[PDB]
């Protein structure tokens, strides 16, 4: 009697497990349907040489999938070799998070963000940003309690999602692997709580998209992301009071 | 008495030198202001194992900058080590070109696209796609004359440009390096002759963008790209008759 | 009123979570106190060239720690570089598991064992073998149900533990990181359900051990391991009926 | 009616384009027939640790070919892997140029020489030295104008050429690729304006050479090189007045 | 009339050639039957950063086999790639030697131990430790004569051997390659002159061992090692007077 | 009363130890004064793909120095990284030996030449060729006895030496390390028993050489090499009868 499946504009089940593991300053396991990512935030009291003494901090991200995160085993990036996909994804995650951090208020420190995918079924890079934001704020909460910053140094909430145009379905939100593999167009969107973009990346896959479709895709991603931000706020509990 | 400089919505000087060098199936030097890129297309009568026997072709791209392409010398990616930036750029160029190739009509062959930047002043990745399209079509023209394909296997023209929101200037088109380094938002846009998108990638740099701005940025990129396509047609001479 | 801490000859809390993740043929999360390891078993219908056509199978293992598995962040082995410690650990895990597999009954297939440490507090390599055994048998159960083997191709149960001689404590079982870092002697022991050894590795750390101590250390490891095997049997449920 | 081809002792067409690109201290495109090499000279106000504080400068060279410089595409040395041929060639170019620089007069600075081959048809390493000398002197001219050196710190002019013994032709000067591939003996010669050698490298290819032939080969290289030096002087214009 | 071959509990011919080569502080060629290893000890007046200023020294070891050390040529570990076997062996040699060095008395210096195998017929890692101990003491003798240490900074003699359980032979000592390749169990033992262990590593190869067998194997290794120590003392000549 | 030292035109002590080690088809230790190199020749019944089915064989060489071959320890090329010097040297050794092998008579087989330097005091690359020739002929003798070739497939004897112009000494033959480090000019010469060259490589080191000096240097190398060939013949014993 229950409706089976998801509507075109409906997220998979989202669960954000906070203080997931003990050692990081900030630790999260994010579940987006079958996609599962361990996100940690590590605080180092150093910044890269290129910016030392300038009084601003930095955020840098690393990404990997455990070999059987995927249905078909993947070759370990062991040192093995780092794929272009990993490199692109790392750049995306780091750029996205830097955009919402008040780097001056962070002070001269680096946030090392690690996103390790333990199960992959689509949307890993955007799940990674969504989980890593929370992990970062959990770390920022510890700094604040330690009196090492005067506020949580974030300018807003930040979350991310995929959207796509899928064979015989049209515009769909939060694609699983099966859906992305038969998507004509796919897109990653990274947005703040005030509805402002930090990153938009759309790709026609052997195919093309109109501007009408771009607007459609974005519309759908915006609401997915506002919902994700609601969930981040659910996960963050009282910490939301330390953010404006 | 002549107006100095460029309007906000004006491209740098664009020059596409065809049959630039002798050995490639297709060879171009593209100049976009001070940005200069050698683009070759190489035809190999093989496709990757993952798709062999399926009767479709493939396009794959490589990118590098000679060490003093840039004002400050860059460390050679010698084997040295391949940067995330290079890997992202290669993925972009290959995805963009694959989208406009009729891969079945190409047959089981790979187009190896090489983009070697000899002078860099912003917009190298988009200059690379713009030049590489022409290099690819020059190669496709040779195949056609050789009776190895029945038409030039392209679905449209394809070109690319950057756009950005720049401190105290607002929306500007085709950013040089100086302008991109003080850009709050920058964007790469890849579009066809029919005004359809193949790739859109926008990044807030320590900052964010509204949807209004996204539409503005896109508007400006569309016309830059239609102009670039006009120039590609200028460069292509009679070959335009072999394309629909 | 409750006794705090552990006796010298007492394991940390052991928990073996079976069918932990969806994609592997066999999946386990093993917890040994704060030490936590994701263990998967992947079946490939191929063996290495050096033994192809000989009708026997193979087991091979890979190991990694996520960067903040540890209290102090570790540099990612990304491709980064693979440490001697990782290489030694992989060799240990693979050798240990091969010893208890009936490789002829497995047929010509490789078991790929992946051990990804998500939290490290000592005993990761032995926790890895203990968890990976179960993951492997879970995979062997699927093969059997699929009629691809005639029995679970194991010759016995197999588990592993550390033991050590610790400053001002003497012989202690299952060392955490703190305890191993002030251990004069440490040892890894790998044993079967019939009390037979597959691997024994003892190291004096800036110090030495007598034969009396070796016997003592082994005695203590044997019972730790019999207890671990009891727990593996608890985790395996009805599958124990398919093993002799 | 015009004689087709080249005499045995005749260079290909030589063209040295100065101030070729904007960013280097010294920039040249050298053309030797179909062989074309972009040569830059970059000044860094540092020397290697092994010689720091000793008041002498250094010259170091890097070499690469763009993938379709060659008739058959070459695999990119991307980081891919650096070939022995590249390593030998780099050593040759750097040794040759160091020999003619007054390193004390240079002061404690490194000249980074980059030789990127955009079209290859034989003689790339010697074309590289010939072009790179000019690029280096163009850089030295800028230093002098900047009052950072008291003279152009060169001890002489320097140029280089190949010579060979070719099936059914005997001793020939400046070999193209076709001619080198059927050469029994080939040789690289590096000489100054005063007729003094900096490097001589002769190789019997599946074959051997007499001393008579060595003298013959050298005779022919000497005059090729004096001609090349004349052309370097043509390219250098008024700068020749700043050299003795 | 002479008995051919070796008893089960008998070493191969052992020869330790001291001051073998000129450049190292300590140089040995050790022969164990056909197994031959060049062992050098190099003194560097530095320790790793992780322990600098703490006043203790360090020992670190490297291992390689020349390509035709083995009956079947091995691929050179050139940079090629370093095997897990090499990494494990290096760790073993370094750990073993550190255990018998008085690191405080050494002072803040590193002993670089190099073990290059020129002929391999089993027992290379244990031959390496046995030879490297002597090479190290030869180096320590030079330091002492130079008044850079107040005694030879060793706590004891140290040597090593393999033992195994071999098809149709039972417990055998010092296995050649042929014997190890049909060994059900093999073991490396590292012991001091006072009969105390520094390392014990036993591996069931597709098979298992009882505790009775472990004791048997150890018994046999102890006497092999006492014999090896006698030979080290033979090789060391008068230097034995500088050790307690 | 004995004259101390060497004349300007005199080799160091040369010793060629044949059948040095057991496993190679051909094995030599060559001593040239303090320079000592283990040279092996390995026969593989395969040639590279680029020449398969063409009925000719191949020779390829690898070179390394053990870390304390040198007075100052060298970093191991472990996989560490392969130096340009090693790559150049390998190319030299392989080219030199190929020139004197009848590759058709060899048949479709590769000779793998390994040159491992155990002590370095100048002239390692030329010592390597001199020793490796003998190792190769020892291997060719085994092939002949096995009826796998119809003659020793060499066209002549081949040996090599350095020569140099040394501060306050002029032209000197067979330079040690000290002498090469204060050499204005150095040269490697590779010659056959009939006085024909296979390779000549001369380098002015911060300095230049005249043609008169080139002739002088060569004269001196020729006689050094004829002497070396005499010694190779001494080492080869009766095998000289199987060569013309």
PDB file of C-alpha atoms in Angstrom, chain F residues 7-241:
ATOM      1  CA  UNK F   7     102.845   7.788 -15.480  1.00  0.00           C
ATOM      2  CA  UNK F   8     100.514  10.185 -17.356  1.00  0.00           C
ATOM      3  CA  UNK F   9      99.826   7.574 -19.988  1.00  0.00           C
ATOM      4  CA  UNK F  10      99.543   4.542 -17.645  1.00  0.00           C
ATOM      5  CA  UNK F  11      96.438   2.554 -16.629  1.00  0.00           C
ATOM      6  CA  UNK F  12      95.662   1.664 -13.047  1.00  0.00           C
ATOM      7  CA  UNK F  13      95.941  -2.031 -12.118  1.00  0.00           C
ATOM      8  CA  UNK F  14      93.390  -3.993 -14.170  1.00  0.00           C
ATOM      9  CA  UNK F  15      92.035  -7.331 -13.029  1.00  0.00           C
ATOM     10  CA  UNK F  16      89.137  -9.213 -14.703  1.00  0.00           C
ATOM     11  CA  UNK F  17      87.710 -12.035 -12.587  1.00  0.00           C
ATOM     12  CA  UNK F  18      85.718 -14.459 -14.764  1.00  0.00           C
ATOM     13  CA  UNK F  19      82.879 -16.817 -13.649  1.00  0.00           C
ATOM     14  CA  UNK F  20      82.840 -14.558 -10.594  1.00  0.00           C
ATOM     15  CA  UNK F  21      79.376 -15.529  -9.396  1.00  0.00           C
ATOM     16  CA  UNK F  22      77.307 -18.637 -10.164  1.00  0.00           C
ATOM     17  CA  UNK F  23      73.836 -17.656 -11.421  1.00  0.00           C
ATOM     18  CA  UNK F  24      74.446 -15.449 -14.541  1.00  0.00           C
ATOM     19  CA  UNK F  25      75.158 -16.892 -17.971  1.00  0.00           C
ATOM     20  CA  UNK F  26      78.263 -14.663 -17.792  1.00  0.00           C
ATOM     21  CA  UNK F  27      79.783 -13.131 -14.670  1.00  0.00           C
ATOM     22  CA  UNK F  28      82.771 -10.833 -14.119  1.00  0.00           C
ATOM     23  CA  UNK F  29      84.199  -8.650 -11.390  1.00  0.00           C
ATOM     24  CA  UNK F  30      86.369  -5.984 -13.007  1.00  0.00           C
ATOM     25  CA  UNK F  31      88.846  -4.010 -10.959  1.00  0.00           C
ATOM     26  CA  UNK F  32      90.381  -0.825 -12.388  1.00  0.00           C
ATOM     27  CA  UNK F  33      92.482   0.475  -9.470  1.00  0.00           C
ATOM     28  CA  UNK F  34      89.952   1.165  -6.699  1.00  0.00           C
ATOM     29  CA  UNK F  35      87.045   1.104  -9.182  1.00  0.00           C
ATOM     30  CA  UNK F  36      85.220  -2.214  -8.856  1.00  0.00           C
ATOM     31  CA  UNK F  37      82.179  -3.361 -10.872  1.00  0.00           C
ATOM     32  CA  UNK F  38      80.160  -6.572 -10.873  1.00  0.00           C
ATOM     33  CA  UNK F  39      79.131  -7.214 -14.511  1.00  0.00           C
ATOM     34  CA  UNK F  40      76.602  -9.902 -15.407  1.00  0.00           C
ATOM     35  CA  UNK F  41      75.127 -11.044 -18.646  1.00  0.00           C
ATOM     36  CA  UNK F  42      71.697 -12.678 -18.655  1.00  0.00           C
ATOM     37  CA  UNK F  43      70.185 -14.401 -21.675  1.00  0.00           C
ATOM     38  CA  UNK F  44      66.411 -14.049 -22.184  1.00  0.00           C
ATOM     39  CA  UNK F  45      64.704 -15.940 -25.067  1.00  0.00           C
ATOM     40  CA  UNK F  46      62.679 -12.836 -26.017  1.00  0.00           C
ATOM     41  CA  UNK F  47      63.258  -9.492 -27.726  1.00  0.00           C
ATOM     42  CA  UNK F  48      61.306  -6.188 -27.304  1.00  0.00           C
ATOM     43  CA  UNK F  49      57.914  -5.958 -29.145  1.00  0.00           C
ATOM     44  CA  UNK F  50      59.233  -3.222 -31.505  1.00  0.00           C
ATOM     45  CA  UNK F  51      61.473  -5.813 -33.208  1.00  0.00           C
ATOM     46  CA  UNK F  52      59.788  -9.183 -32.571  1.00  0.00           C
ATOM     47  CA  UNK F  53      59.683 -11.653 -35.472  1.00  0.00           C
ATOM     48  CA  UNK F  54      62.498  -9.772 -37.256  1.00  0.00           C
ATOM     49  CA  UNK F  55      65.006 -12.464 -36.270  1.00  0.00           C
ATOM     50  CA  UNK F  56      67.552 -10.135 -34.620  1.00  0.00           C
ATOM     51  CA  UNK F  57      68.540  -9.989 -30.967  1.00  0.00           C
ATOM     52  CA  UNK F  58      69.127  -7.113 -28.619  1.00  0.00           C
ATOM     53  CA  UNK F  59      71.425  -5.982 -25.813  1.00  0.00           C
ATOM     54  CA  UNK F  60      70.235  -3.733 -22.995  1.00  0.00           C
ATOM     55  CA  UNK F  61      72.120  -2.470 -20.022  1.00  0.00           C
ATOM     56  CA  UNK F  62      71.394  -1.399 -16.450  1.00  0.00           C
ATOM     57  CA  UNK F  63      73.819   0.396 -14.063  1.00  0.00           C
ATOM     58  CA  UNK F  64      73.803   1.170 -10.353  1.00  0.00           C
ATOM     59  CA  UNK F  65      76.199   1.985  -7.556  1.00  0.00           C
ATOM     60  CA  UNK F  66      75.742   0.492  -4.105  1.00  0.00           C
ATOM     61  CA  UNK F  67      75.285   3.459  -1.697  1.00  0.00           C
ATOM     62  CA  UNK F  68      78.782   3.410  -0.141  1.00  0.00           C
ATOM     63  CA  UNK F  69      80.559   2.566  -3.394  1.00  0.00           C
ATOM     64  CA  UNK F  70      81.533   6.233  -3.061  1.00  0.00           C
ATOM     65  CA  UNK F  71      83.507   8.057  -0.369  1.00  0.00           C
ATOM     66  CA  UNK F  72      80.395  10.143   0.466  1.00  0.00           C
ATOM     67  CA  UNK F  73      77.336   7.897   0.704  1.00  0.00           C
ATOM     68  CA  UNK F  74      74.923   8.208  -2.286  1.00  0.00           C
ATOM     69  CA  UNK F  75      71.127   8.003  -1.949  1.00  0.00           C
ATOM     70  CA  UNK F  76      69.916   4.633  -3.212  1.00  0.00           C
ATOM     71  CA  UNK F  77      68.094   4.618  -6.555  1.00  0.00           C
ATOM     72  CA  UNK F  78      65.429   2.450  -4.934  1.00  0.00           C
ATOM     73  CA  UNK F  79      62.242   3.367  -6.869  1.00  0.00           C
ATOM     74  CA  UNK F  80      64.800   7.276  -4.226  1.00  0.00           C
ATOM     75  CA  UNK F  81      64.791   8.056  -7.972  1.00  0.00           C
ATOM     76  CA  UNK F  82      66.835   7.203 -11.138  1.00  0.00           C
ATOM     77  CA  UNK F  83      69.384   9.913 -11.914  1.00  0.00           C
ATOM     78  CA  UNK F  84      70.184  11.375 -15.327  1.00  0.00           C
ATOM     79  CA  UNK F  85      73.730  10.130 -14.839  1.00  0.00           C
ATOM     80  CA  UNK F  86      72.530   6.537 -14.495  1.00  0.00           C
ATOM     81  CA  UNK F  87      70.270   6.899 -17.506  1.00  0.00           C
ATOM     82  CA  UNK F  88      73.067   8.293 -19.698  1.00  0.00           C
ATOM     83  CA  UNK F  89      75.484   5.596 -18.538  1.00  0.00           C
ATOM     84  CA  UNK F  90      72.972   2.788 -19.307  1.00  0.00           C
ATOM     85  CA  UNK F  91      72.409   4.165 -22.787  1.00  0.00           C
ATOM     86  CA  UNK F  92      76.179   4.314 -23.367  1.00  0.00           C
ATOM     87  CA  UNK F  93      76.842   0.745 -22.231  1.00  0.00           C
ATOM     88  CA  UNK F  94      73.991  -0.750 -24.252  1.00  0.00           C
ATOM     89  CA  UNK F  95      74.824   1.201 -27.423  1.00  0.00           C
ATOM     90  CA  UNK F  96      78.497   0.221 -27.140  1.00  0.00           C
ATOM     91  CA  UNK F  97      77.867  -3.505 -26.741  1.00  0.00           C
ATOM     92  CA  UNK F  98      75.168  -3.633 -29.441  1.00  0.00           C
ATOM     93  CA  UNK F  99      77.640  -2.212 -31.925  1.00  0.00           C
ATOM     94  CA  UNK F 100      79.962  -5.229 -31.587  1.00  0.00           C
ATOM     95  CA  UNK F 101      77.344  -7.989 -31.456  1.00  0.00           C
ATOM     96  CA  UNK F 102      76.210  -9.801 -34.573  1.00  0.00           C
ATOM     97  CA  UNK F 103      72.535  -9.441 -33.639  1.00  0.00           C
ATOM     98  CA  UNK F 104      71.281 -11.725 -36.452  1.00  0.00           C
ATOM     99  CA  UNK F 105      73.660 -14.495 -35.302  1.00  0.00           C
ATOM    100  CA  UNK F 106      72.519 -13.980 -31.700  1.00  0.00           C
ATOM    101  CA  UNK F 107      69.011 -14.804 -32.926  1.00  0.00           C
ATOM    102  CA  UNK F 108      65.881 -13.468 -31.311  1.00  0.00           C
ATOM    103  CA  UNK F 109      67.176 -13.178 -27.669  1.00  0.00           C
ATOM    104  CA  UNK F 110      68.048 -10.194 -25.398  1.00  0.00           C
ATOM    105  CA  UNK F 111      71.282  -9.935 -23.481  1.00  0.00           C
ATOM    106  CA  UNK F 112      70.502  -8.188 -20.169  1.00  0.00           C
ATOM    107  CA  UNK F 113      73.709  -6.566 -18.977  1.00  0.00           C
ATOM    108  CA  UNK F 114      73.858  -5.557 -15.305  1.00  0.00           C
ATOM    109  CA  UNK F 115      76.694  -3.361 -14.023  1.00  0.00           C
ATOM    110  CA  UNK F 116      76.679  -2.931 -10.294  1.00  0.00           C
ATOM    111  CA  UNK F 117      79.450  -0.733  -8.937  1.00  0.00           C
ATOM    112  CA  UNK F 118      80.667  -1.888  -5.512  1.00  0.00           C
ATOM    113  CA  UNK F 119      83.517   0.620  -5.277  1.00  0.00           C
ATOM    114  CA  UNK F 120      83.794   3.856  -7.276  1.00  0.00           C
ATOM    115  CA  UNK F 121      86.982   5.840  -7.856  1.00  0.00           C
ATOM    116  CA  UNK F 122      86.488   7.177 -11.406  1.00  0.00           C
ATOM    117  CA  UNK F 123      85.967   5.481 -14.760  1.00  0.00           C
ATOM    118  CA  UNK F 124      82.956   3.406 -13.667  1.00  0.00           C
ATOM    119  CA  UNK F 125      81.083   3.645 -16.960  1.00  0.00           C
ATOM    120  CA  UNK F 126      84.094   2.609 -19.044  1.00  0.00           C
ATOM    121  CA  UNK F 127      85.133  -0.070 -16.538  1.00  0.00           C
ATOM    122  CA  UNK F 128      81.544  -1.281 -16.874  1.00  0.00           C
ATOM    123  CA  UNK F 129      81.807  -1.628 -20.650  1.00  0.00           C
ATOM    124  CA  UNK F 130      85.200  -3.348 -20.422  1.00  0.00           C
ATOM    125  CA  UNK F 131      83.935  -5.900 -17.829  1.00  0.00           C
ATOM    126  CA  UNK F 132      80.506  -6.332 -19.432  1.00  0.00           C
ATOM    127  CA  UNK F 133      82.063  -7.244 -22.801  1.00  0.00           C
ATOM    128  CA  UNK F 134      83.813 -10.195 -21.133  1.00  0.00           C
ATOM    129  CA  UNK F 135      80.662 -11.170 -19.190  1.00  0.00           C
ATOM    130  CA  UNK F 136      78.727 -11.104 -22.482  1.00  0.00           C
ATOM    131  CA  UNK F 137      81.325 -13.298 -24.281  1.00  0.00           C
ATOM    132  CA  UNK F 138      81.292 -15.759 -21.320  1.00  0.00           C
ATOM    133  CA  UNK F 139      77.505 -15.958 -21.852  1.00  0.00           C
ATOM    134  CA  UNK F 140      77.991 -16.364 -25.629  1.00  0.00           C
ATOM    135  CA  UNK F 141      80.434 -19.209 -24.942  1.00  0.00           C
ATOM    136  CA  UNK F 142      77.708 -21.057 -22.960  1.00  0.00           C
ATOM    137  CA  UNK F 143      75.195 -20.545 -25.811  1.00  0.00           C
ATOM    138  CA  UNK F 144      77.699 -21.958 -28.310  1.00  0.00           C
ATOM    139  CA  UNK F 145      78.389 -25.029 -26.161  1.00  0.00           C
ATOM    140  CA  UNK F 146      74.605 -25.464 -25.924  1.00  0.00           C
ATOM    141  CA  UNK F 147      74.417 -25.327 -29.750  1.00  0.00           C
ATOM    142  CA  UNK F 148      72.056 -22.324 -29.524  1.00  0.00           C
ATOM    143  CA  UNK F 149      74.330 -20.187 -31.733  1.00  0.00           C
ATOM    144  CA  UNK F 150      76.813 -21.316 -34.397  1.00  0.00           C
ATOM    145  CA  UNK F 151      79.631 -18.988 -33.324  1.00  0.00           C
ATOM    146  CA  UNK F 152      80.285 -16.458 -30.598  1.00  0.00           C
ATOM    147  CA  UNK F 153      78.213 -13.648 -32.132  1.00  0.00           C
ATOM    148  CA  UNK F 154      80.771 -10.839 -31.760  1.00  0.00           C
ATOM    149  CA  UNK F 155      82.307  -8.811 -34.570  1.00  0.00           C
ATOM    150  CA  UNK F 156      85.371  -7.837 -32.508  1.00  0.00           C
ATOM    151  CA  UNK F 157      86.778  -7.194 -29.046  1.00  0.00           C
ATOM    152  CA  UNK F 158      85.570  -4.042 -27.324  1.00  0.00           C
ATOM    153  CA  UNK F 159      86.953  -2.054 -24.441  1.00  0.00           C
ATOM    154  CA  UNK F 160      86.734   1.459 -23.053  1.00  0.00           C
ATOM    155  CA  UNK F 161      88.637   4.034 -21.014  1.00  0.00           C
ATOM    156  CA  UNK F 162      88.562   7.623 -19.846  1.00  0.00           C
ATOM    157  CA  UNK F 163      91.119  10.261 -20.724  1.00  0.00           C
ATOM    158  CA  UNK F 164      91.346  13.854 -19.557  1.00  0.00           C
ATOM    159  CA  UNK F 165      93.237  17.119 -19.448  1.00  0.00           C
ATOM    160  CA  UNK F 166      94.100  17.693 -15.800  1.00  0.00           C
ATOM    161  CA  UNK F 167      95.181  20.886 -14.000  1.00  0.00           C
ATOM    162  CA  UNK F 168      99.015  21.115 -14.044  1.00  0.00           C
ATOM    163  CA  UNK F 169      99.392  17.641 -15.658  1.00  0.00           C
ATOM    164  CA  UNK F 170      98.039  17.919 -19.217  1.00  0.00           C
ATOM    165  CA  UNK F 171      96.795  14.790 -20.985  1.00  0.00           C
ATOM    166  CA  UNK F 172      96.317  11.872 -18.560  1.00  0.00           C
ATOM    167  CA  UNK F 173      94.866   8.376 -19.112  1.00  0.00           C
ATOM    168  CA  UNK F 174      92.365   6.457 -16.879  1.00  0.00           C
ATOM    169  CA  UNK F 175      91.394   9.148 -14.350  1.00  0.00           C
ATOM    170  CA  UNK F 176      90.605   8.414 -10.731  1.00  0.00           C
ATOM    171  CA  UNK F 177      87.842  10.434  -9.021  1.00  0.00           C
ATOM    172  CA  UNK F 178      90.251  13.090  -7.586  1.00  0.00           C
ATOM    173  CA  UNK F 179      91.793  13.586 -11.067  1.00  0.00           C
ATOM    174  CA  UNK F 180      88.437  13.818 -12.832  1.00  0.00           C
ATOM    175  CA  UNK F 181      87.187  16.374 -10.301  1.00  0.00           C
ATOM    176  CA  UNK F 182      90.021  18.735 -11.239  1.00  0.00           C
ATOM    177  CA  UNK F 183      89.898  17.898 -14.947  1.00  0.00           C
ATOM    178  CA  UNK F 184      89.291  20.778 -17.397  1.00  0.00           C
ATOM    179  CA  UNK F 185      88.406  18.237 -20.101  1.00  0.00           C
ATOM    180  CA  UNK F 186      87.339  14.614 -19.770  1.00  0.00           C
ATOM    181  CA  UNK F 187      86.528  12.003 -22.339  1.00  0.00           C
ATOM    182  CA  UNK F 188      85.143   8.468 -22.658  1.00  0.00           C
ATOM    183  CA  UNK F 189      86.395   6.365 -25.565  1.00  0.00           C
ATOM    184  CA  UNK F 190      85.046   3.004 -26.717  1.00  0.00           C
ATOM    185  CA  UNK F 191      87.124   1.132 -29.274  1.00  0.00           C
ATOM    186  CA  UNK F 192      87.426  -2.294 -30.949  1.00  0.00           C
ATOM    187  CA  UNK F 193      90.462  -4.599 -31.358  1.00  0.00           C
ATOM    188  CA  UNK F 194      90.877  -3.340 -34.947  1.00  0.00           C
ATOM    189  CA  UNK F 195      91.206   0.270 -33.669  1.00  0.00           C
ATOM    190  CA  UNK F 196      87.754   1.368 -34.817  1.00  0.00           C
ATOM    191  CA  UNK F 197      85.525   3.574 -32.654  1.00  0.00           C
ATOM    192  CA  UNK F 198      82.096   2.730 -31.363  1.00  0.00           C
ATOM    193  CA  UNK F 199      81.728   5.798 -29.135  1.00  0.00           C
ATOM    194  CA  UNK F 200      83.668   9.001 -28.409  1.00  0.00           C
ATOM    195  CA  UNK F 201      82.347  11.474 -25.856  1.00  0.00           C
ATOM    196  CA  UNK F 202      84.439  14.502 -24.825  1.00  0.00           C
ATOM    197  CA  UNK F 203      83.318  17.311 -22.519  1.00  0.00           C
ATOM    198  CA  UNK F 204      84.971  20.591 -21.685  1.00  0.00           C
ATOM    199  CA  UNK F 205      84.262  21.211 -18.024  1.00  0.00           C
ATOM    200  CA  UNK F 206      83.882  24.953 -17.574  1.00  0.00           C
ATOM    201  CA  UNK F 207      86.496  25.043 -20.241  1.00  0.00           C
ATOM    202  CA  UNK F 208      87.159  24.079 -23.838  1.00  0.00           C
ATOM    203  CA  UNK F 209      89.401  21.872 -25.930  1.00  0.00           C
ATOM    204  CA  UNK F 210      91.138  22.284 -29.290  1.00  0.00           C
ATOM    205  CA  UNK F 211      91.188  19.735 -32.082  1.00  0.00           C
ATOM    206  CA  UNK F 212      94.881  19.165 -31.379  1.00  0.00           C
ATOM    207  CA  UNK F 213      93.939  18.127 -27.844  1.00  0.00           C
ATOM    208  CA  UNK F 214      91.129  15.878 -29.136  1.00  0.00           C
ATOM    209  CA  UNK F 215      93.646  14.034 -31.299  1.00  0.00           C
ATOM    210  CA  UNK F 216      96.062  13.807 -28.352  1.00  0.00           C
ATOM    211  CA  UNK F 217      93.382  12.489 -26.000  1.00  0.00           C
ATOM    212  CA  UNK F 218      92.298   9.899 -28.574  1.00  0.00           C
ATOM    213  CA  UNK F 219      95.853   8.726 -29.258  1.00  0.00           C
ATOM    214  CA  UNK F 220      96.276   8.030 -25.533  1.00  0.00           C
ATOM    215  CA  UNK F 221      92.881   6.293 -25.209  1.00  0.00           C
ATOM    216  CA  UNK F 222      93.629   3.992 -28.193  1.00  0.00           C
ATOM    217  CA  UNK F 223      96.673   2.462 -26.516  1.00  0.00           C
ATOM    218  CA  UNK F 224      94.977   2.240 -23.129  1.00  0.00           C
ATOM    219  CA  UNK F 225      92.207   0.328 -24.884  1.00  0.00           C
ATOM    220  CA  UNK F 226      94.560  -1.990 -26.848  1.00  0.00           C
ATOM    221  CA  UNK F 227      96.135  -2.840 -23.439  1.00  0.00           C
ATOM    222  CA  UNK F 228      92.685  -3.459 -21.936  1.00  0.00           C
ATOM    223  CA  UNK F 229      91.848  -5.747 -24.857  1.00  0.00           C
ATOM    224  CA  UNK F 230      95.067  -7.674 -24.220  1.00  0.00           C
ATOM    225  CA  UNK F 231      93.879  -8.148 -20.617  1.00  0.00           C
ATOM    226  CA  UNK F 232      90.374  -9.228 -21.796  1.00  0.00           C
ATOM    227  CA  UNK F 233      92.108 -11.825 -23.957  1.00  0.00           C
ATOM    228  CA  UNK F 234      94.170 -12.891 -20.879  1.00  0.00           C
ATOM    229  CA  UNK F 235      90.925 -13.301 -18.907  1.00  0.00           C
ATOM    230  CA  UNK F 236      89.126 -15.135 -21.716  1.00  0.00           C
ATOM    231  CA  UNK F 237      91.675 -17.996 -21.924  1.00  0.00           C
ATOM    232  CA  UNK F 238      90.772 -20.553 -24.590  1.00  0.00           C
ATOM    233  CA  UNK F 239      87.558 -18.741 -25.543  1.00  0.00           C
ATOM    234  CA  UNK F 240      89.720 -16.402 -27.708  1.00  0.00           C
ATOM    235  CA  UNK F 241      89.947 -19.326 -30.174  1.00  0.00           C
TER     236      UNK F 241
END
